[PDB]
Structures are given as C-alpha cells and as structure tokens.
C-alpha cells in the first residue's frame, strides 16, 4: 500500500517533518501532499493519509490548508488509514497545543477512518479535550516542539515514523 502526506504549505517546519517522514518510512511508497503542489481531492486515492499542521505558527489554520479544509469533509475516507501529527510549544503556549490537530481529527471521527500513532500526554500538562482521546491519556497524533526539545523532535518523528509504519501494517494484514 501507499501513503499521501498532507500539510499546509504556508506553515513552518512541516516541510522538513513531511520531508523526513517520508525518507524515514521510505520514499518508495510515500508521496508528499503538499496542498500548494497538489489538490485536495487527491486525498482520496492513497490507501494512508498522513495529516502534519502546526498550531498557531503564523496563527491558528494558514491560508493555503483552510482553503481547503472545508473541502476536506466532501472527501470520502471510508475506512483508510490516517496519521495525524503536529507542532506547537507547551511553554509558550499551552492549552492551545495541536488545536488543529483535534480540528482535523474531529472532522475525520465521522468519516470512518483508522486513527495510527498517538502520542503519549504523559508528562504534558494541558486541559483542552480537542488535541485527545481517552480522557486525555493520549494526544490523537503525534506531537512535535521546536522551543523545548528541539534537539529530540528529530526522535519524535523517528520513533513515530517507525511505529505507524508498523501499526498500519498490522492493521491491514
């Protein structure tokens, strides 16, 4: 099988995620999605949909993913495979941590697809429902940080790389 990994274009850092992920994964069966390259409706065919939006980089949701994130609900996405990662910094910010990861993992509940990866909360102080499940004992997708930890969000994308790769494998066996 195949995966589309899909980011807004305006927004810092998620190229080089989206660049890494895909060389981590490997870059035979993953295709970068980037929305100023190609359309949304693409979205459709791969059998993974990768998600990657940072929160409140410029500002909450860039230009170039909102104009078509009111598109992204006519999508089909019956039963595919989705991963969904973000950026933010809970030092600075706080509480408003991967608002738009929960955003499109919110949009995507109804659609049927099989959520992948994770990340743990543990060790993380929040109160917001929409970046989590479980009560709030896993984020919805992966978390990324350039303020903190900048050193090991190379890590953060490594070991969550490996384990979607595997988790979606097992998955679909």
Same mark, same amino acid.
């Given at each position: 099988?195949?995966?589309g990994?899909f980011?807004?274009?305006?927004?810092c850092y998620?190229?080089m995620?989206a660049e890494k992920?895909?060389?981590?994964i +490997?870059?035979?069966?993953?295709? =970068?999605?980037?929305?100023k390259?190609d359309s949304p *409706? $693409?979205?459709?065919q791969?059998?993974v949909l990768?998600?990657?939006?940072?929160?409140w980089?410029?500002?909450e949701?860039?230009e170039?993913?909102?104009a078509?994130?009111?598109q992204?609900?006519?999508l089909?996405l019956?039963?595919?495979?989705?991963?969904?990662?973000?950026l933010?910094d809970?030092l +600075?910010?706080?509480?408003?941590? =991967?608002d738009?990861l929960?955003?499109?993992?919110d *949009? $995507?509940?109804?659609?049927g697809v099989k959520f992948?990866?994770?990340?743990?909360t543990?060790?993380?102080?929040?109160?917001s429902p929409?970046?989590?499940?479980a009560?709030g004992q896993l984020?919805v997708g992966?978390?990324l940080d350039?303020?903190?930890?900048?050193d090991?969000s190379?890590?953060?994308?490594?070991?969550?790389?490996?384990?979607?790769?595997?988790?979606m494998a097992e998955?679909?066996?």
């Amino acid at each position: 099988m195949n995966m589309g990994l899909f980011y807004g274009s305006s927004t810092c850092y998620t190229e080089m995620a989206a660049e890494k992920i895909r060389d981590i994964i +490997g870059p035979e069966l993953v295709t =970068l999605h980037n929305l100023k390259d190609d359309s949304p *409706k $693409l979205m459709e065919q791969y059998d993974v949909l990768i998600l990657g939006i940072p929160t409140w980089d410029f500002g909450e949701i860039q230009e170039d993913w909102e104009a078509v994130w009111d598109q992204l609900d006519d999508l089909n996405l019956e039963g595919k495979i989705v991963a969904l990662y973000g950026l933010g910094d809970q030092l +600075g910010y706080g509480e408003w941590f =991967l608002d738009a990861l929960g955003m499109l993992h919110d *949009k $995507l509940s109804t659609k049927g697809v099989k959520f992948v990866g994770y990340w743990p909360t543990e060790g993380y102080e929040f109160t917001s429902p929409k970046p989590v499940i479980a009560d709030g004992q896993l984020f919805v997708g992966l978390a990324l940080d350039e303020t903190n930890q900048y050193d090991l969000s190379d890590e953060r994308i490594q070991s969550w790389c490996e384990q979607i790769l595997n988790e979606m494998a097992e998955h679909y066996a």
